[PDB]
Amino acid sequence: GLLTPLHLEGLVQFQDVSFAYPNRPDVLVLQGLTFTLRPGEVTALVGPNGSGKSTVAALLQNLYQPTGGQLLLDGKPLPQYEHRYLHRQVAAVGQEPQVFGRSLQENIAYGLTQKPTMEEITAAAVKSGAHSFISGLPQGYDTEVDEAGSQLSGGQRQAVALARALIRKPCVLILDDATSALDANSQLQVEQLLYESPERYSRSVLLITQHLSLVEQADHILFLEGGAIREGGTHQQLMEKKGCYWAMVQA
Numbered sequence: 001g002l003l004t005p006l007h008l009e010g011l012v013q014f015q016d017v018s019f020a021y022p023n024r025p026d027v028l029v030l031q032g033l034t035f036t037l038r039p040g041e042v043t044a045l046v047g048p049n050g051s052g053k054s055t056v057a058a059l060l061q062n063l064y065q066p067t068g069g070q071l072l073l074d075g076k077p078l079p080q081y082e083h084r085y086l087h088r089q090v091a092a093v094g095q096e097p098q099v100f101g102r103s104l105q106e107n108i109a110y111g112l113t114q115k116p117t118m119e120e121i122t123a124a125a126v127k128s129g130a131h132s133f134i135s136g137l138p139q140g141y142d143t144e145v146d147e148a149g150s151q152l153s154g155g156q157r158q159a160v161a162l163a164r165a166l167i168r169k170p171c172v173l174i175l176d177d178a179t180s181a182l183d184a185n186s187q188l189q190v191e192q193l194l195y196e197s198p199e200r201y202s203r204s205v206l207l208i209t210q211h212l213s214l215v216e217q218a219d220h221i222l223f224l225e226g227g228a229i230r231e232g233g234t235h236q237q238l239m240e241k242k243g244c245y246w247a248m249v250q251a
């Protein structure tokens with residue numbers, strides 16, 4: 001299939017979604033997940049290593065298909081969308097950023113049906129927390145990277161990957177520990193973009209992060225354990241429940 005609606009709200013619905021990787025079909029890593037991501041909101045996904053947070057992010061990118069249940073974007077199954085089209089609407093930034101052998105400007109504009117404008121490129125970098133280091137860099141945005149970011153540190157690579165995701169105006173944004181290496185100032189830009197930017201009403205967000213301050217501001221928090229959601233609610237509700245999240249916050 002290949003759907004390409006002009007506008008896409010970014011409404012994500014996981015409906016009793018279960019999943020087992022192809023190479024270990026006998027073990028469900030995600031079990032009966034049901035939750036919704038709405039435009040203008042942020043959902044934080046927390047839990048121990050191996051609880052399935054990255055796997056959820058992988059399914060939302062349509063890298064794999066649910067073993068059970070359904071996952072809809074604007075009421076339609078992800079596969080019904082033209083892969084290129086879907087790849088634009090849904091953006092994911094991960095722990096290890098994908099860099100190219102082009103220039104920083106080309107790296108941020110990579111994968112666009114429309115060659116951007118330096119003003120737009122710069123704006124994406126300002127919001128991702130990349131602009132700053134790039135500016136104080138001899139040759140700035142024209143600077144060329146030696147594949148895999150030899151000259152770029154970890155944080156600089158993440159900030160750049162995030163810019164590439166932002167300049168597409170995704171209606172669905174996925175942050176999987178995408179800023180674990182960002183400096184203080186860039187981290188504030190990520191917070192501004194998630195909770196203060198006008199752009200937030202045009203996209204839903206799945207947030208996986210170690211920064212408990214960002215988590216606390218989330219509209220919804222889902223605690224993942226052994227592939228299943230054990231707790232769900234705002235920060236206060238979960239703190240009041242004094243359950244898994246509560247135990248996590250106060251370590």
Ligand SMILES: Nc1ncnc2c1ncn2[C@@H]1O[C@H](COP(=O)(O)OP(=O)(O)O)[C@@H](O)[C@H]1O
Nearest residue numbers: 021023024029048049050051052053054055056
């Ligand atoms: N490529 C893979 N093939 C088979 N099983 C995998 C694969 N990747 C992850 N898993 C299983 O899923 C679990 C982790 O899911 P993941 O989404 O990475 O967890 P988390 O992000 O919470 O640390 C692992 O413990 C492993 O058992």
Ligand SMILES: [Mg+2]
Nearest residue numbers: 053054055176
């Ligand atoms: Mg992970």
